[PDB]
Design an enzyme around this catalytic site. Structure first.
Site, PDB file in Angstrom:
ATOM      1  N   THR A 142       0.830  -1.202   0.000  1.00 18.90           N
ATOM      2  CA  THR A 142       0.000   0.000   0.000  1.00 18.90           C
ATOM      3  C   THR A 142       0.856   1.240   0.000  1.00 18.90           C
ATOM      4  OG1 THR A 142      -0.395  -0.319   2.371  1.00 18.90           O
ATOM      5  CG2 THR A 142      -2.122  -1.040   0.852  1.00 18.90           C
TER       6      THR A 142
ATOM      7  N   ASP B  90      -3.150   0.172  -4.104  1.00 19.59           N
ATOM      8  CA  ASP B  90      -4.287   0.298  -3.211  1.00 19.59           C
ATOM      9  C   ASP B  90      -5.538  -0.270  -3.878  1.00 19.59           C
ATOM     10  OD1 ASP B  90      -6.224   0.986  -1.359  1.00 19.59           O
ATOM     11  OD2 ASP B  90      -6.183   3.120  -1.887  1.00 19.59           O
ATOM     12  N   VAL B  91      -5.855  -1.510  -3.537  1.00 21.71           N
ATOM     13  CA  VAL B  91      -6.994  -2.200  -4.148  1.00 21.71           C
ATOM     14  C   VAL B  91      -8.357  -1.567  -3.838  1.00 21.71           C
ATOM     15  CG1 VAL B  91      -5.723  -4.363  -4.203  1.00 21.71           C
ATOM     16  CG2 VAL B  91      -7.236  -3.857  -2.263  1.00 21.71           C
TER      17      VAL B  91
ATOM     18  N   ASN C 281      -4.278 -11.204  -1.259  1.00 26.12           N
ATOM     19  CA  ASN C 281      -3.830 -11.396   0.120  1.00 26.12           C
ATOM     20  C   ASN C 281      -3.965 -10.047   0.836  1.00 26.12           C
ATOM     21  OD1 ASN C 281      -2.149 -12.594   2.408  1.00 26.12           O
ATOM     22  ND2 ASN C 281      -0.650 -11.133   1.613  1.00 26.12           N
TER      23      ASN C 281
ATOM     24  N   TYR D   2     -13.870  -9.911  11.326  1.00 32.01           N
ATOM     25  CA  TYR D   2     -12.912 -10.688  10.545  1.00 32.01           C
ATOM     26  C   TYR D   2     -13.549 -11.978  10.076  1.00 32.01           C
ATOM     27  CZ  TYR D   2      -8.012 -12.324   9.624  1.00 32.01           C
ATOM     28  OH  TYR D   2      -6.840 -12.785   9.060  1.00 32.01           O
TER      29      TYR D   2
ATOM     30  N   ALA E 195     -16.787 -12.469   9.536  1.00 33.45           N
ATOM     31  CA  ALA E 195     -17.740 -12.206   8.450  1.00 33.45           C
ATOM     32  C   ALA E 195     -17.012 -11.987   7.145  1.00 33.45           C
ATOM     33  CB  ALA E 195     -18.622 -10.988   8.758  1.00 33.45           C
TER      34      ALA E 195
ATOM     35  N   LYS F 141     -13.957 -12.940   6.197  1.00 37.33           N
ATOM     36  CA  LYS F 141     -13.185 -14.028   5.562  1.00 37.33           C
ATOM     37  C   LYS F 141     -14.082 -15.154   5.034  1.00 37.33           C
ATOM     38  CE  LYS F 141      -8.749 -12.804   6.033  1.00 37.33           C
ATOM     39  NZ  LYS F 141      -8.033 -12.242   4.807  1.00 37.33           N
TER      40      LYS F 141
END
Lengths: 253, 242, 245, 253
Positions: free
Chosen positions: D43, D68-69, D95, D160, D162, D164
């Site tokens: 990032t 930055d996705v 990832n 986390y 929810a 993943k």
């Protein structure tokens, strides 16, 4: 002279294997509370009679019978007797089951084979004997009482885990062949439930199990019964091939 | 009956599954507050509850908005009473192949289907924690577990709802609050050549009825399901098996 | 290569998936012992292994006794080394709707696919436990997690297989043995069917093709490696997308 | 003057997000060891530079880039830059994601939104952007790094969990839209891996963690990379829509 209202299973003939104690007993009493004619089985005449007395005591019509679900011959004959004198079971709960615990390196032939043939091969025996009944009626409920150990696994129990995990595979496959006839097939997987068997286990081992249970308690057999009683009702007509885990959050998937 | 004394909140309850959940819990003795996006939706819920002889109210709620939720529920918790059974049922679809999917199409589905669970639960969880009793029942979809081309957004949202379901259940179990999900299949109200193709994928060979979802929900609501938590009950006629 | 130094025991290795697993662990530098049902099939394994430049042997495996297997095993350990990679790929189908199923169709599929996991698995664990290293990899089927009309016996055995996997995983992990299952979908073999049924079947698979035995072999190979050391109690589905979970 | 044998991923262009440390870095080195042109991303520019040090130092041909996705322009630029110099990425390893842990009755709005945004929303823009390159090539690998917490769930981690579990749901759905074109979409769900997160721990709570792990140890970042390296290869061509869990036995399903 009081005439109560008809309940969800009013009139349905239900078979419940291993009904003399804990979970099976509670299932039988719950199906009866909902109007089924209840036929529970135990491995002994003394179990078979305990059942009749428990049904009589709770006002439930039906019978306690001797069935060894490991024996091909005992199944065919008890089921032919049921058909001859009792009715065609439209709700079948397969609750008969046993454990033979050991690490797999310490495990004797018998302990492996007994658990497979009692917890798993029985589902072949009971279902094959009842399915023609459900197919004519164009209605049915098969409910197989599995265990948390099926999906979770547990050290000392490769045999139990194998048989119970297979019970869910059988459930799915059979749901697939019998849905056209409006027969549902579902598995109920209890966690750690307070029973005869589990009270024998030591208080450090139990105080540890509780630590793994989000609800902070062991369930009651009644709590399995209620779920099973629901799966048997019309309200669950659209549920099949399912495994309902009743484990207080010990296992989540 | 079995929920007499309890107040139940059901989001998105103006038609289909939500409505039927609402009538079901009302039938079992709950005072039902069903929610809709619009005033007229909300008034229609109240007309339906009365017509069916059930007590409760219709409420305007936008479960995708932080303010509408937090404030609305502060209102109810204050003047109407305290929701101990919450059914999170509201959800949208914005179907598109991922290569084709627009920004709004992805974010509106995640926000409304997933963040709402954060919104609603945050708001009622103190009331349940205090009461030492609760039922939070999240309405998922067979698509969460199974996937569906053109629904990568819906599948992520709903699959995320099951994972939320499992985590919350661990936090709140010690307070005797169960958190459970119910994954409808293809339901009649919730909807020749492609008709058959679909029924051909369902072992029961039929679409489910809205009431068949609600019956499962009513059960999970009841005392009898006290030892079920963290679960997903697929109600999909055999369409997907897990 | 990635398996050099190791001895693998691979059951039902005369054909299809079993054969492929065998060639693949060989390719990877394992000494490979492939088992068959018949004396002639065990000989044929040995030749196949030789024609691919793989060190190994055929084995007709006598699983009648605790003692019969353990001795078959010291015989292996005498001439070849302690097998630390074991692939359970025994099993057949005998399909039918339950109402039509004959008893021996039920017990045969259960015996060959599920009970077979008890005997060999118990007998190799002792040398794995000594070595503080091992791999047990059980070959299951999409049919275990999914179910299939006509295959209640198969489904129950293959689903037992996964249960077996998870619990054994929990007994043997402290000694660095992994126990994992591989659930192949629909694969190109002898069996595979009628051309009419062929196209409708592919329609069920997002990848639009059957799997190759080799593809199953590759997944098994990798689970055997040092790189899969942190994967255990898992079921890896190798199904083309026909089933996901 | 030395010419080595080609590896399973030779020639293939691979994009790996979060590649400056831990799992992402390891994933990047493994894809390189396997012959791939690796573009790892971070990032921040210090992270992108650091990635470029590591690729060069370990002899991998590739690039360290700022991505930055969250942002469409970032995504569009990164990809054009990758397109002009290196090729279309046919292997993309999503990832991402941080944790912002809290019970829900304490959790702060942004702690919820940051995690969903980072762990789930992160899948949208990049995946959407690489797909078309893949459908045209009729070959591709999308690999989404999730977490055991999607499946197991965890107190303090509703956010986390929810996100993943959503990651895995996205995976199955995407897998179904692109399998016709020989593209596989898979998830990898690490357990407790030796990372910054686990190192920040009080040795006391770090040991509680080991005791819930059959293997008795933390995972190595290398051990995630191997699994991902395998799923990228031709060997894993028939695996799609799968979640491969790499958790040492901490969760089994």
């Amino acid at each position: 002279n009081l005439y109560f209202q008809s309940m969800s299973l009013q009139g349905k003939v239900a078979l419940v294997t291993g009904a003399s104690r804990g979970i099976g007993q509670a299932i039988a009493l719950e199906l009866g509370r909902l109007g089924a004619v209840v036929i529970g089985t135990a491995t002994s005449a003394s179990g078979a009679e305990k059942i009749a007395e428990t049904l009589k005591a709770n006002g439930v019509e039906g019978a306690g019978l001797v069935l060894d679900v490991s024996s091909d011959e005992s199944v065919a004959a008890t089921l032919e007797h049921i058909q001859q004198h009792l009715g065609q079971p439209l709700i079948v709960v397969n609750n008969a089951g046993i454990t033979r615990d050991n690490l797999l390196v310490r495990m004797k032939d018998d302990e492996w084979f007994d658990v497979v043939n009692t917890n798993l091969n029985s589902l072949y025996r009971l279902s094959k004997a009842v399915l023609r009944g459900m197919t004519k009626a164009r209605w049915g409920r098969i409910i197989n009482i599995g265990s948390v150990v099926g999906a979770m696994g547990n050290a000392g129990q490769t045999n139990y885990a194998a048989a119970k995990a297979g019970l869910e595979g059988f459930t799915r496959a059979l749901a697939r062949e019998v849905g056209s006839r409006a027969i549902t097939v579902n598995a109920v997987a209890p966690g750690f439930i307070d029973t005869d068997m589990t009270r024998e286990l030591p208080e450090a081992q139990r105080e540890a199990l509780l630590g793994q249970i989000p609800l902070g308690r062991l369930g009651q057999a009644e709590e399995i019964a209620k779920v099973v009683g629901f799966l048997a009702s019309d309200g669950a007509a659209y549920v099949t091939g399912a495994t309902v885990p009743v484990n207080g959050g010990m296992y989540m998937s």
